[PDB]
């Protein structure tokens, strides 16, 4: 029997810890107890910042990284931080995994990728009402990676930071809101601090579950087939779980914390998407500079959406 330590950064109630426990449960069952997983939520073994270098060094066998936290490190997979028009985490998670499977880009070659998934589409959660793009001008809003670049294009003032830091940051006025999926309203009780939600339907945050290469290779071939066997299935399961939970989280925020929901005029939606168009070209150029083929990646994303 082997035991793998699985490091995670956010609290146990958030969906990246929920999916980790479900994955562990499937591993235990399909390997008939030949593999066990000891999980460490809340940064008790590795936090957001040292997660990648701590999995690669062996301080943890398995870890969960939010790709948007590591700008310039993932030139190919960061395409998934651009607005690709996904409305569900299930479809996004599934396409992300299939894209990774077919490309196996070199940026992730020093680790073994066990599975991937994404958040749901991002929205604005603010302390003060955002009813139009004008209200957003100058406003300090939390994002990370390309979601920050989207905020800047909209005229907001992006402040980049990992999730576990955001509550204190809101609570003390350093930021006026955040740009992400609405599950955090409940799971991290942002419904108490940010009383306003504005629909944006924007890019998702992509994640990878990563494993130390040596640890992966000391596993028997049949255990390895079980874990690879779980990859696509779990990507879909996570997105599915998250799409339902967003609905629950939001019903709970509205009818037990008075959260007000807003929607942008049709001309603001139009203008906002024109503003962000140039992020696709800046993404392609950064990718091309690091040796990847942005044309094939975009071709592949297109084909996989036409199919999920
Ligand atoms: N805000 C993004 C993605 C995200 C959405 N929900 C959670 C919950 C816990 C951690 C991250 C996220 C991010 O910071 O990665």
**205 ligand 1 Cβ < 6 A:** yes
Do residues 185 and 200 touch, judged by C-beta distance below 8 A?
Answer: no
Neighbours of 301 (CB within 10 A): 18
Do residues 153 and 276 touch, judged by C-beta distance below 8 A?
Answer: yes
Torsion angle (degrees, nearest 10) of CA 22, 24, 27, 33: -130
SS3 of the chain: the string is CEEEEEECCCCCCCHHHHHHHHHHHHHHHHCCCCEEEEEECCCCCCCCCCHHHHHHHCCCCEEEEEHHHCCCCCCCHHHHHCCCCCCCHHHHHHHHHHHHHHHCCHHHCCEEEEEEEECCCEEEEECCCCCCCCCCCCCEEEECCHHHHHHHHCCCEEEECCHHHHHHHHHCCCCCEEEECCCHHHHCCHHHCCCEEEEEEECCCEEEEEEEHHHHHCCCHHHHHHHHHHHHHHHHHHHHHHHHHHHHHHHHHHHHHCCEEEECCHHHHHHHHHHHCHHHHHHHHHHHHCCCCHHHHHHHHHHHHCCC
Do residues 297 and 103 touch, judged by C-beta distance below 8 A?
Answer: yes
Do residues 174 and 140 touch, judged by C-beta distance below 8 A?
Answer: yes
Q: How far apart, in whole angstroms, are the C-alpha atoms of residue 52 and residue 213?
A: 12
Q: How was this structure determined?
A: X-ray
Neighbours of 106 (CB within 10 A): 12
Of 202, 225, 188, the closest CA to residue 279 belongs to: 202
- Counting from 1 in the atom list of ligand 1, the atom nearest the Cα of 166 is 14
Q: Domain range holding 61?
A: 1-308
- Counting from 1 in the atom list of ligand 1, the atom nearest the Cα of 181 is 5
**16 ligand 1 Cβ < 6 A:** yes
Q: How far apart, in whole angstroms, are the C-alpha atoms of residue 171 and residue 127?
A: 10
- Contacting residues for 64 by C-beta, under 8 A, at least 6 apart: 6, 7, 8, 9, 16, 20, 51, 207, 208, 209, 210
**119 ligand 1 Cβ < 6 A:** yes
Do residues 145 and 159 touch, judged by C-beta distance below 8 A?
Answer: no
**163 ligand 1 Cβ < 6 A:** yes
Instruction: Look up residue 12 and give its two tokens.
Output: 């146990």
Neighbours of 275 (CB within 10 A): 15
**249 ligand 1 Cβ < 6 A:** no
- Contacting residues for 107 by C-beta, under 8 A, at least 6 apart: 73, 74, 75, 76, 77, 290
The residue nearest atom 8 of ligand 1, judged by CA position, is: 14
Q: Residue 239, CB half-sphere, CA atoms under 13 Å: how many?
A: 29
- Contacting residues for 176 by C-beta, under 8 A, at least 6 apart: 126, 127, 128, 139, 140, 141, 170
Q: What is the CATH number of the domain that holds 200?
A: 3.40.190.170
**148 ligand 1 Cβ < 6 A:** no
Q: Are strands 196-202 and 260-263 parallel, antiparallel or unpaired?
A: parallel
- Contacting residues for 302 by C-beta, under 8 A, at least 6 apart: none
Angle at 268 between CA 262 and CA 272, to 5 degrees: 110
Q: Are strands 140-143 and 157-160 parallel, antiparallel or unpaired?
A: parallel
Domains in the chain, number: 1
Of the residues 68, 81, 117, 205, which should be mutated to test ligand 1's pocket, given the most ligand atoms within 8 Å of the CB?
205
Q: Cα of 163 to ligand 1 centre, how many Å?
A: 6
Of the residues 8, 180, 194, which should be mutated to test ligand 1's pocket, given the most ligand atoms within 8 Å of the CB?
180
**181 ligand 1 Cβ < 6 A:** yes
Q: How far apart, in whole angstroms, are the C-alpha atoms of residue 42 and residue 81?
A: 24
Resolution, given in Å to one decimal, reads: 2.3
Q: Cα of 180 to ligand 1 centre, how many Å?
A: 7
Instruction: Look up residue 273 and give its two tokens.
Output: 């998407």
**145 ligand 1 Cβ < 6 A:** no
Q: Cα of 145 to ligand 1 centre, how many Å?
A: 12
**144 ligand 1 Cβ < 6 A:** yes
């Amino acid at each position: 029997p082997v035991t793998l330590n699985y490091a995670n950064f956010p609290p146990a109630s958030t969906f990246p810890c929920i999916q980790m426990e479900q994955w562990a449960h499937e591993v235990r069952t399909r390997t008939r107890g030949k593999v066990d997983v000891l999980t460490y939520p809340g940064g008790t073994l590795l936090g957001a910042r040292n997660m990648l270098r701590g999995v690669m060094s062996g301080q943890a066998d398995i870890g969960c990284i939010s790709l948007a936290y590591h700008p310039g490190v993932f030139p190919v997979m960061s395409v998934f931080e651009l607005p690709l028009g996904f409305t569900s985490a299930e479809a996004a998670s599934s396409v992300l995994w299939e894209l990774y499977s077919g490309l196996r880009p070199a940026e992730l070659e020093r680790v073994k990728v066990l599975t991937m998934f994404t958040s749901a589409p991002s929205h604005f959660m603010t302390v003060t009402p955002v009813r139009s793009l004008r209200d957003l001008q100058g406003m300090e809003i939390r994002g990370a990676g390309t979601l920050s670049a989207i905020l800047e294009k909209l005229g907001a003032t992006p402040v980049s930071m990992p999730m576990p830091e955001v509550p204190e940051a809101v609570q003390k006025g350093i930021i006026k809101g955040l740009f992400t999926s609405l599950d955090v309203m409940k799971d991290m009780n942002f419904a108490e601090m940010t009383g306003h939600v504005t629909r944006a339907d924007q890019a998702v945050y992509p994640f990878a579950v990563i494993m130390n290469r040596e640890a992966w290779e000391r596993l028997s071939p049949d255990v390895q087939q079980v874990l690879d066997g779980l990859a696509a299935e779990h990507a879909a399961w996570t997105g599915r779980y998250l799409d339902a939970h967003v609905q629950d989280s939001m019903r709970w925020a509205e009818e037990k914390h008075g959260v007000q929901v807003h929607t942008l005029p049709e001309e603001d939606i139009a203008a906002m998407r024109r503003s962000v168009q140039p992020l696709f070209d800046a993404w392609a150029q950064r990718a091309a500079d690091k040796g990847a083929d942005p044309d094939a990646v975009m071709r592949t994303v297109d084909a996989l959406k036409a199919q999920y």
